[PDB]
Write a protein that binds this ligand. Structure first.
Ligand SMILES: O=c1ccn([C@@H]2O[C@H](COP(=O)(O)OP(=O)(O)OP(=O)(O)O)[C@@H](O)[C@H]2O)c(=O)[nH]1
Ligand SMILES: O=c1ccn([C@@H]2O[C@H](COP(=O)(O)OP(=O)(O)OP(=O)(O)O)[C@@H](O)[C@H]2O)c(=O)[nH]1
Ligand SMILES: O=c1ccn([C@@H]2O[C@H](COP(=O)(O)OP(=O)(O)OP(=O)(O)O)[C@@H](O)[C@H]2O)c(=O)[nH]1
Ligand SMILES: O=c1ccn([C@@H]2O[C@H](COP(=O)(O)OP(=O)(O)OP(=O)(O)O)[C@@H](O)[C@H]2O)c(=O)[nH]1
Ligand SMILES: O=c1ccn([C@@H]2O[C@H](COP(=O)(O)OP(=O)(O)OP(=O)(O)O)[C@@H](O)[C@H]2O)c(=O)[nH]1
Ligand SMILES: O=c1ccn([C@@H]2O[C@H](COP(=O)(O)OP(=O)(O)OP(=O)(O)O)[C@@H](O)[C@H]2O)c(=O)[nH]1
Lengths: 68, 68, 66, 67, 66, 66
C-alpha cells in the first residue's frame, strides 16, 4: 500500500534530513520534510511550501537513510 | 486532491488571506489569494478570479510564513 | 461542489472564457456544456476539452461565485 | 460522462473527421472507429489506439448535433 | 472493453507495434503481455511500460478486431 | 496489477541492474531496492525514492525470468 512511502517520508521527517525534491518539470526543491498526507508534502525552507505528490518525480536525501 | 493536511493548510491560507504563489506543472506562476477550494479546484483571486485545477499545480508557496 | 456551479454560471450566463491547457495552449470561447471529465467549448471552432489537460479557467469578467 | 460518451458516439456513427490534439502538442487525424472508458480507436491514414489521458482536445471537422 | 482485446489481439498475433510515449519517445517491439497498468514490450530485453506514460499504440499492420 | 509486482520483485530479488526512464525523459540507473503500490526505492551511489507516476519505462540490463 503505502508500506514503503510512509516510513520513508516519516523517517526523513523525524530525523530532519535535508532533502532535494525533483519535480517532473525538472525543478529542484530543497529543504526538509515538515509533514505529509496521502496527496501532499509540506517542504520547509524560507517558508513551508505545499508540494503536490503528483508533481514529484524523485525524492533524494542528502545522506543515506535507514528505513525502520 | 483533498486530505489530512492539504485542507487545513489551504483553509489557513484562505482565512488569513495570505497572498500565495501557485506554480503550475509547466512552470507558469500564478499569484493571488485563495478565495475557496474543493477536492479538485482552487479559486484564485486578483482582477477576476480564476479556477485552477489541482492536478495542474506543482506547488503552493505562501508569501509569508504561516501556522498549520 | 465548487467546480460544478462555477462552470454552470459561466455556461448559463454565456460568459466568454480563456481555458489554459497544461502545455501552455490558450483556448477561447464560451462553455456550451460539461460533465465530470470534459468541457465543450464553442465559438471560433467548437471542441471537446479534457479537464485533465486544463490548468486554469479564466473568465473575461467577474462572476457570482457561491 | 453524460456529455463525453454521446459526443464520441455521434462522431463515431456519423464518421465525422476529427483532429485529436495530444497533451504534447501533436495532432492526430482521422475518424473514430470505436472507444471505451479509457481509449479511442482512430482509423484511416494511420490506424491507432489513443489513450484518453494523453488527449487535450477533440476538434471535429464539423459541429455535432447531440441526441 | 476495447483496450484489452486490441492489446490481446496484438499480443497473440505477434504484431510489431510502435508505442509513442507522451514525451514523444517512440518504443518498438512486440507485446509479450499486459495488465491493468503496464505493458511488457519485447525486444532485446523485455521492458516494462507504464500505460500512464503512453500516448498512442500503432501496429505495423492492420488489426482485425474479433 | 497482477504483472507489475512479480516483475519488480524479480528485479529486486536478483538485484538486476536496471535503467528507469522518467516521463520527462530523464534516465536513472541502479537497482530496485524495494517498492510498494506507488513508489520505487532505487539504489545507487545515492539512493532515492521514485514515484511510479513519474516513470515511463523500466528496462533491465539483461534478460530476466517472466
Ligand atoms: O506528517 C505526517 C506524520 C506522520 N504521519 C503518519 O502518522 C503515523 C504515525 O506517525 P508518528 O511519526 O507520530 O509515529 P511514531 O509513533 O513512530 O512517532 P513518534 O511518536 O515516535 O514521534 C505514521 O503512519 C505516519 O505514516 C503522516 O501521515 N504524516
Ligand atoms: O473553500 C473552502 C472552505 C472551507 N472548506 C472546508 O470546510 C470545512 C469548514 O471550514 P471552516 O473554516 O468554515 O470551518 P471553521 O469552523 O474552521 O471556520 P470558522 O468557524 O473558524 O470561521 C473545513 O474542513 C475546510 O477545509 C473547503 O473545503 N473549502
Ligand atoms: O452541461 C452541464 C450543465 C449542467 N450540469 C449540472 O446539472 C445540474 C442541473 O443543471 P441546470 O442548469 O438544469 O441546473 P439549474 O439551472 O436548475 O441550477 P440553478 O439555476 O438552480 O443554480 C447542475 O447541478 C449542473 O451542475 C452539468 O453537469 N453539465
Ligand atoms: O465504440 C463504442 C461505441 C458505443 N459505445 C457506447 O455503447 C452504447 C450503445 O451505443 P450504440 O450506438 O450501439 O446504441 P445507440 O447509440 O443506438 O443507443 P443510444 O445511445 O441512442 O441509447 C452507447 O452508450 C455508446 O456510448 C461505446 O462506449 N463505445
Ligand atoms: O497478457 C495478457 C494476456 C491476456 N489477458 C487477458 O486475459 C484474458 C484471457 O486471454 P486469452 O488470450 O488467454 O483468452 P483466449 O485465448 O480465450 O482469447 P480471447 O477469448 O480472450 O480472445 C483476456 O481477457 C485478455 O484480455 C491479459 O490481461 N493480459
Ligand atoms: O519491496 C517489495 C518487496 C516485496 N513486495 C511484495 O511483497 C511480497 C513479499 O514476498 P517476497 O518476494 O519477500 O517472497 P515471495 O512472495 O516470493 O514468497 P512467499 O511469501 O510468497 O512464499 C510479494 O508479494 C512481493 O510482490 C513488495 O511489494 N515490495
Amino acid at each position: 500500500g503505502h508500506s514503503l512511502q510512509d516510513p520513508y517520508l516519516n523517517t526523513l521527517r523525524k530525523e530532519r534530513v535535508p532533502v532535494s525534491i525533483y519535480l517532473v518539470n525538472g525543478i529542484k526543491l530543497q529543504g526538509q520534510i515538515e509533514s505529509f498526507d496521502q496527496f501532499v508534502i509540506l517542504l520547509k525552507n524560507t517558508v513551508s511550501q505545499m508540494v503536490y505528490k503528483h508533481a514529484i518525480s524523485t525524492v533524494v536525501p542528502s545522506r543515506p537513510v535507514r528505513l525502520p
